[PDB]
Amino acid sequence: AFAVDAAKAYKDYLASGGQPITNCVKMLCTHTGTGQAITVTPEANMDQESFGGASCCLYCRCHIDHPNPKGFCDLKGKYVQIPTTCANDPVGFTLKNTVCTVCGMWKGYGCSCDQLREPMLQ
Amino acid sequence: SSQAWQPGVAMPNLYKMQRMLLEKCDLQNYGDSATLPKGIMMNVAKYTQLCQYLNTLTLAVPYNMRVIHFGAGSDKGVAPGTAVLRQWLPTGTLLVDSDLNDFVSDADSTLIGDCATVHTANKWDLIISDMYDPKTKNVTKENDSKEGFFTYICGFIQQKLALGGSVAIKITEHSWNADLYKLMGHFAWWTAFVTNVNASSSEAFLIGCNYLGKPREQIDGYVMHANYIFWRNTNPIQLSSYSLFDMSKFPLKLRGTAVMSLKEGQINDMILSLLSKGRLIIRENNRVVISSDVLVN
Ligand SMILES: C[n+]1cn([C@@H]2O[C@H](COP(=O)(O)OP(=O)(O)OP(=O)(O)OC[C@H]3O[C@@H](n4cnc5c(N)ncnc54)[C@H](O)[C@@H]3O)[C@@H](O)[C@H]2O)c2nc(N)[nH]c(=O)c21
Ligand SMILES: C[n+]1cn([C@@H]2O[C@H](COP(=O)(O)OP(=O)(O)OP(=O)(O)OC[C@H]3O[C@@H](n4cnc5c(N)ncnc54)[C@H](O)[C@@H]3O)[C@@H](O)[C@H]2O)c2nc(N)[nH]c(=O)c21
Ligand SMILES: C[S@@+](CC[C@H](N)C(=O)[O-])C[C@H]1O[C@@H](n2cnc3c(N)ncnc32)[C@H](O)[C@@H]1O
Ligand SMILES: [Zn+2]
Ligand SMILES: [Zn+2]
Q1: Is A8 helix (H, G, I), strand (E, B) or coil?
Q2: Are A29 and B37 inside 8 Å of each other by CB?
Q3: In this structure, is the dihedral angle defined by the CA atoms of residues A74, A80, A82 and A87, taken in order, positive or negative?
Q4: CA-CA-CA-CA torsion for B124, B126, B130, B136, nearest 10 degrees?
Q5: How many angstroms does the Cα of residue B172 sit away from the middle of ligand 2?
Q6: Mode of pairing for the β-strands spanning A79-83 and B8-10
Q7: Which cell locations does it reside in (chain A)?
Q8: From B97, B130, B146, B173, active-site residue
Q9: I want to staple B83 with a disulfide (CB 3.0 to 4.6 A). Which of A52, B13, B72, B216 is the partner?
Q10: Across the interface, which of B41, B76, B247 has its CB nearest the CB of A29?
Q11: Please, what sign has the CA dihedral across residues A80, A23, B172, B229?
Q12: 8-state DSSP, B75
């Protein structure tokens, strides 16, 4: 039953006031993209910075197993858009926040689905 | 000068036609570093300018394009270069990278170990090498042709590069190989490219464009490497990154280049013509199978 929950160990390491995981590969883009959290190509906007998924993944970076029966990674081979105001800790940001299934934006940093984009059909 | 708004500078044709002797590479701005956009890594800027330049070439870009990238690892444990290639290459392109040391990558598949142990039964559409042996810094004798990983690449280009395929091998003043320059003569065109972000280094990417499998011209490695140092010594390049501030047309267009398996004898002058324009890629279209040898002892 023993499991080495890294996320909780990293949140505590940051709460203790520790320098976050650096060397996150930041990409060069126009900054005029959709704005979605995770994409197959840099989609940053005037308020975001795009990075390489694998370089922002705690599991990939720490050479540990991904929380999933098959052990599949959702950042590797993708590009994660991070708010310019949180770009100092891209890895920690992808853990403390979750993406939206409706618009794909970060909940709290782009998503506005809980304000009626459409009238739920009728 | 005016070549500051370009991603880099290519070795002029009149410099390749010379027959100079090898000499110490004395760059005028050696050590000077370039000003990069806030928070951008050096190898992200470098691979960006390299890709920006490749866009101007007659590269063959088919559907489900195959690209292998040797020396993709770094002493930071990440693949900035692979991240750029992943961005630049059309969505659905098969990208495989490899390094001597372990690292995290956005590649569809990563192999860890000496490129010597890397084996594959498939031909590739594009080969990118950024491999450099640190032991090269120990300059104790003449600057002679290096072997090591260059031996492998020269063989991998002949056995695993698809006709119409292109390459981009990174070299320096002391990190170079005679047989590598001789192979550039087996392509429809070639050149020594120098990124502006690293124009203060003797580094350059030898670029073969549209492999033909047969020599078009008789190049001499030692002489051609002497022509390069001479060009670099007599032509100081100013450090620039102005090409990095415009990513509007960076992605490689999916030219949908044709892919045919034409044996070894149906290669007439009408096909060599099609290979020399990136309109054709000659190789098998089976499933990609790669592997790394494990030395047990
Ligand atoms: C870059 N390049 C050069 N050549 C060869 O070299 C000759 C002159 O090409 P260059 O690159 O040395 O010329 P220049 O310095 O003047 O031009 P630049 O570097 O800007 O090359 C790119 C541009 O050249 C233009 N161009 C086309 N034909 C020529 C030509 N005959 N002379 C000069 N420029 C040309 C293209 O339209 C393109 O906009 C070409 O006629 C061709 O045989 C190539 N051949 C293939 N197959 N693929 C290439 O990618 C390639
Ligand atoms: C061209 N050059 C070489 N040397 C001397 O000769 C040595 C070997 O020369 P080199 O073949 O390494 O070429 P150069 O110095 O241009 O390479 P540079 O350090 O810019 O690195 C080139 C690229 O290789 C890779 N690389 C360099 N060092 C390492 C390393 N330790 N590990 C891994 N990759 C590395 C990187 O991608 C890097 O960008 C140099 O370390 C230096 O003492 C020079 N000295 C003067 N005064 N002026 C020069 O112009 C000059
Ligand atoms: C300049 S570093 C590559 C940096 C990387 N392209 C990046 O984007 O940061 C050169 C690499 O060559 C690798 N290398 C050197 N000799 C090698 C060999 N024989 N086989 C495989 N990789 C090798 C080193 O491990 C090193 O990571
Ligand atoms: Zn991961
Ligand atoms: Zn939403």
Answers
A1: helix
A2: no
A3: positive
A4: 70
A5: 7
A6: unpaired
A7: Host cytoplasm, Host perinuclear region; Host cytoplasm; Host endoplasmic reticulum
A8: B130
A9: A52
A10: B247
A11: positive
A12: T
Q: Which two tokens stand for residue B82?
A: 């692979």
Bridge partners, residue B70, by sequence? B98, B129
Q: Given B46, B123, B146, B160, which residue is catalytic?
A: B46
CA–CA distance, B256 with B59 (Å, rounded to integer): 11
**What technique determined this structure?**
X-ray
- Report how far residue B62's alpha carbon sits from residue B47's, in angstroms, rounded to the nearest whole number: 21
- The total number of structural domains in chain A stands at 1
Question: Do B78 and A42 make contact, defined as CB atoms within 8 angstroms?
Answer: no
- Residue reference for tokens 């054709």: B280
Among B243, B240, B237, B187, residue whose Cα is nearest residue B216 = B187
| Cα distance between residue B96 and residue B290, in whole Å | 9
**Å between B99 CA and nearest CA of chain A:** 16
CB contact burial B204-243 (16+ within 10 A = b; e otherwise): bbbbbbbbbbeebeebebebbbbbbbbbbbeeebebbbeb
Helices and strands counted in chain A (H then E): 4, 3
Residue B46 bears catalytic tag: yes
Instruction: Answer for the pair B211, B186: CB distance below 8 angstroms, yes or no.
Output: yes
- Please report the DSSP string for B81-149 in residue order: HHHHHHHHSPTT-EEEEEESS--B-SSSEEEES-GGGEEESS-EEEEEE----GGGG---S--PPP-TH
* Residue A24 structural domain: 1-122
* Rounded Cα distance, B74 and B72, in Å: 7
Tell me if B250 sits within 8 A of B52, measured CB to CB. Answer: yes
What is the C-alpha separation between B162 and B115, in angstroms, rounded? 19
Beta-strand (E) ranges in chain B? 8-10, 66-70, 94-99, 109-112, 118-120, 124-129, 161-171, 187-195, 204-211, 258-260, 280-282, 290-292
Query: How far apart (Å, rounded) are the C-alpha atoms in residues B81 and B97?
Result: 10
Instruction: Locate B255 and state its tokens.
Output: 């030219």
3-state secondary structure of B157: helix
Ligand 3 atom at minimal distance to the Cα of residue B81: 8
Q: Whole-angstrom Cα distance, residue B281 to residue B59?
A: 10
